[PDB]
Design a protein around this ligand. Structure first.
Ligand SMILES: [Cl-]
Lengths: 385, 354
């Protein structure tokens, strides 16, 4: 493992005009303590060696770059390869970042890690990692969410995490984030706040990317050892997560002929494209979670680095309808025997619109962020065939 | 990346006095052909190549031999390593076997593959490798199981397979179908208690686990483990880990199989199967059991200390290791097999625990 040193973000956490840390003076000291501790850690071979050991032994890295022969033939276009992040522990790509942040918590001396969770996957990713290192864990979760996520709540309790219900406001992720951040600020000396999103204040965006970058670097290597060259295009779902960021960053900052990068977002309800693309075309920008970025003032935003990618021209952003995503979901399962997370099914849907036109000798990599076993019931709610 | 050529069973499928099964006259010709095809397949490099390719790129092999540090410190005894079979695609170790069998069926020119399942784990495994190889898949499930397993039924359906309705009523309905359409159908069985050559075949495809542990132990310890522990029951988990060690001239690790706390349909059979029975007699493996309450405690112990939620089945072995690892020395090594992940039994364990 080698943590990158990309030309961006800059010292202030800026990717061009995007990024930064537009936060209250109460958060500042905590964030600068973190940034400093992270800058040090990424250089230390002791940290790198340890991180690498856990990614391999615990998370199960590196993940295979799987050739979907049936998919390739079905589309009749370029050869399609799947980066199997679904074969990770917890079942999500999230763990690369959670493992990295928890390890930095231990290295900083913190004995406690907190985070917030909506659906519950993050909460489980954090609870899981805290168990590995033996850290006290508290996950803030809106009450609404706590009732429609009994399973994941039980898992967190099994992992030994304390799930702290949030009744405030509308009892959702939004509220949980406030209770959490406040906790972290008060208990900064002993606690670390684990954020898995690429949309947030510096150095979170840079840190999440760096930890997720192990995805693209593996693709870069696996490709060179497989085709003697890099892919023609990389396709991944985008939406305030981190999945695409890890795949993209190792190629975004490369010279002229890097592979084409395609971020696929969910069609904005009442729109023809996603919020990001829509913001790019309209030129509307704003601040979100102390991060300047494209904002159409699913997620309200996709992040500063993705905003930079758009203007730098290293990545284009497309969208697909809810129906096209379900079509992608059913497709992969039927042809490859792999049930992908709904997020990834979106990437599959878009690849359907561009892979067929490409040459049969070209290579395309699609990122499978996680497994769909979590989304099976939601997809089956619309029970049919 | 070749297949194993173990001394047992013999040409007839017997492990000492074990193996003999009562197979109706109309099934004998299908089992003989299966033997012929299989014996011929393991001789072909191209066959071994595809198996390995898929085992690696699709299933995710090799699985890590993980050092459970917090749990080795807790028991205070020997070092504990967990063979992470829970990282495999689908979450179960049984996929080593289904991938191999669906591959055999394709080589044999079959275009259809059938199977039967209770809770649905086997149905999904089969359906998965059926979609992977473009084979037609039909899973026989009982009316009851089908209602209590809405998820798996849907999964199977998404994988493109057809689910047609107690599992007892589904097994002998499938054997019939197999016989009638044997010319075009292959029957995937994930059990080590059926008639020859299934126990040998399943053992061979599962062997990959044990062989991996053998080389992983050698590279990390320079020697083989002191004891290997695995739950013996639903599936072929313990056999895959055991076989590559059970026939070693010596320097053999102690093999400890762990067991759980009427009517025989189709090709099912009571017991642990021919090979585990032979191991016991020959004395190359010893067996034990734990109470439901003890395994339940293991489930929770591994979740809290290692961040790994095991299958209730693996929790039985965990529980058993709890009774022997602490006595041992901190310089000794113990490998525990984690057959699958417990993200399924977690709903059940959630009930009987308030
Ligand atoms: Cl992203």
């Amino acid at each position: 493992l080698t943590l990158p040193d990309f030309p961006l973000p800059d010292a202030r956490g800026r990717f061009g005009p995007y990024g930064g840390r537009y936060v209250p003076e109460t958060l500042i000291p905590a964030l600068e303590e973190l940034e400093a501790a992270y800058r040090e850690a990424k250089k230390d071979p002791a940290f790198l060696e340890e991180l690498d050991h856990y990614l391999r032994q615990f998370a199960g890295r590196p993940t295979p770059l799987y050739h979907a022969k049936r998919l390739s033939e079905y589309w009749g276009g370029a050869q399609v390869f799947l980066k199997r992040e679904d074969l990770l522990h917890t079942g999500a790509h999230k763990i690369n970042n959670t493992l990295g942040q928890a390890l930095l918590a231990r290295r900083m001396g913190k004995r406690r890690v907190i985070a917030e969770t909506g659906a519950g996957q993050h909460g489980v990713s954090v609870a899981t990692v805290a168990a590995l290192f033996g850290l006290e864990c508290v996950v803030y979760m809106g009450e609404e969410d706590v009732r429609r996520q009994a399973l994941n709540v039980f898992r967190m309790k099994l992992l030994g995490a304390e799930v702290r219900p949030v009744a405030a406001g509308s009892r959702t992720l939004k509220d949980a984030t406030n209770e959490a951040i406040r906790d972290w600020i008060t208990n900064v000396r002993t606690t670390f706040y684990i954020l898995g999103s690429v949309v947030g204040p510096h150095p979170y965006p840079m840190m999440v990317r760096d930890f997720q970058s192990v995805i693209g670097e593996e693709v870069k290597r696996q490709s060179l050892e497989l085709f003697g060259r890099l892919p023609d295009a990389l396709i991944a779902a985008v939406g305030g997560g981190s999945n695409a960021i890890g795949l993209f960053a190792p190629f975004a900052y490369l010279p002229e002929g890097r592979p084409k990068l395609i971020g696929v977002e969910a069609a904005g309800e009442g729109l023809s494209t996603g919020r990001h693309a829509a913001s790019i075309g309209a030129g509307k920008r704003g601040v979100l979670h102390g991060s300047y970025m494209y904002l159409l003032y699913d997620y309200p935003g996709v992040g500063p680095e993705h905003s930079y990618y758009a203007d730098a021209g290293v990545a284009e952003y497309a969208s697909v309808t809810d129906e096209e995503a379900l079509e992608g979901f059913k497709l992969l399962a039927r042809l490859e025997g792999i049930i992908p997370a709904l997020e990834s099914a979106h990437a599959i849907a878009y690849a359907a619109k561009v892979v067929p036109e490409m040459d049969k000798d070209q290579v395309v990599v699609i990122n499978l962020s996680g497994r769909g076993d979590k989304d099976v019931t939601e997809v089956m709610r619309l029970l049919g065939g």
